[PDB]
From Swiss-Prot, chain B:
The active site is at residues 25, 163, 182. Zn(2+) 3 binds at residues 71, 114. This is Cathepsin L. Zn(2+) 1 binds at residue 9. Zn(2+) 5 binds at residues 137, 140. The chain holds residues 114 to 333 of 333 of the full protein. Disulfide bonds join 22-65, 56-98, 156-204. Zn(2+) 4 binds at residues 92, 96. It comes from Homo sapiens (Human). It comes from the Eukaryota. The gene is CTSL. Zn(2+) 2 binds at residues 50, 86. Zn(2+) 6 binds at residue 160. Zn(2+) 7 binds at residue 162. Glycans are attached at residue 108.
Amino acid sequence: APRSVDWREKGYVTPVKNQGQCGSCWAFSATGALEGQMFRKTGRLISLSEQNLVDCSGPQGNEGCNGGLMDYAFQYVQDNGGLDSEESYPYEATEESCKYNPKYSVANDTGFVDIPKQEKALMKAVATVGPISVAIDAGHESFLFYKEGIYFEPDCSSEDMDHGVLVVGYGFESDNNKYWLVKNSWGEEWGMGGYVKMAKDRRNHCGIASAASYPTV
Amino acid sequence: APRSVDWREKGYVTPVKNQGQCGSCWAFSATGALEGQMFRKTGRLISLSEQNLVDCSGPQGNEGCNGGLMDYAFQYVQDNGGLDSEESYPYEATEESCKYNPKYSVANDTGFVDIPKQEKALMKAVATVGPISVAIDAGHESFLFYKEGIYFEPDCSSEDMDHGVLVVGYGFENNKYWLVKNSWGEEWGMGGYVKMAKDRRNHCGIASAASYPTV
Ligand SMILES: *C(=N)C1(NC(=O)[C@@H]2Cc3ccc(c(Cl)c3)OC/C=C/CCc3ccccc3C(=O)N2)CC1
Ligand SMILES: *C(=N)C1(NC(=O)[C@@H]2Cc3ccc(c(Cl)c3)OC/C=C/CCc3ccccc3C(=O)N2)CC1
């Protein structure tokens, strides 16, 4: 793998979204990774309907605005045979009723892939694949109020993760200088324009390599 | 016909766009009446690609960024299948190479209907269908540096028109007006909109080249 990656600078990443008062992180994480893969494939960046996942992917094991898994989102897309654009199926930020229309579907998959739970396996993947759906331990007062620099929270857990995010690359900066560039779904006024630099290669910090995946496209 | 009409009140109209330093007025006009008809059919408002129509409707007789006519644009969407979204084929404000992809198509038409050269006939169309493609004489100063009110250019042409726009409704304020959507950004007129004088000897030829696409 490369030494320094940023998939934003390749037009692989849509602008930062906001999930608001609803627990749909998983669906922003899924549409992020599906957006980048549809992009490598088709050359067009089209924003995908997080609401389509929030509404319809209940049977494949999701909990609407109370939690979900990214791979379950990928599984819904494959079974459903598609996913509408953000434009046709806008984010209403509550679980509503399934209004999927196949005439607007702008994405597909043939499944997903689970990266081994090593930070180097997640490095190589972020490098050859594109942006990657990951889960983190986000429960700390200090994440909720993030600003800049490399995030490192001593009390962070490596096996119990609660939040789904998207890894868009990584790089360095004198001390412990490596990081994951993580796209969050809490809008632009949070973090470094919606992004958090996570500590990379400090014992799997916040469990970023523990539940990492991407859709096959 | 209803005392007053507005299609923005009913979500048939996408926001006022801007053609820039390119002569693509026919295209923005064409996409507007086609956006309003799709909403009629489906229930989803989706923004369409002027740049698709600027590049690829050449075979129908349109002249890229140096002009065109709305009915060749409608003909192009039938003589092609559908048309791509704004997001998949963005607007570059210049004539460039044709880049259409059928995988990203979100509109269709079964043809187009032309309205008889009469203002009364146009009132009925707006009221019974939705946004209507029209063509007007815009060469005049009171249009360029125009802020507010019912427009009236005493020396406006009824035969010779050079600018395609969209009619999104009409109303009363014994006065009448045309609720016309322009493509000169939100910065011009009434948020990109203009009140043309209505039922006043076919002012600026609003009713002269009026069409709308069927679905
Ligand atoms: C997002 N705002 C919220 N969190 C979720 O929806 C989580 C994200 C999450 C946590 C952990 C893992 C992933 Cl891939 C995603 O990794 C393994 C998962 C363990 C249990 C996660 C899980 C399983 C089923 C249903 C929900 C859920 C979960 O907590 N998902 C809502 C706050
Ligand atoms: C928009 N910025 C410009 N105007 C045009 O491109 C026009 C719009 C137009 C004018 C007239 C009519 C329609 Cl439907 C649309 O109706 C009468 C027909 C006129 C024919 C003029 C014409 C012919 C060929 C190519 C373009 C064109 C024209 O001026 N169209 C560019 C300034």
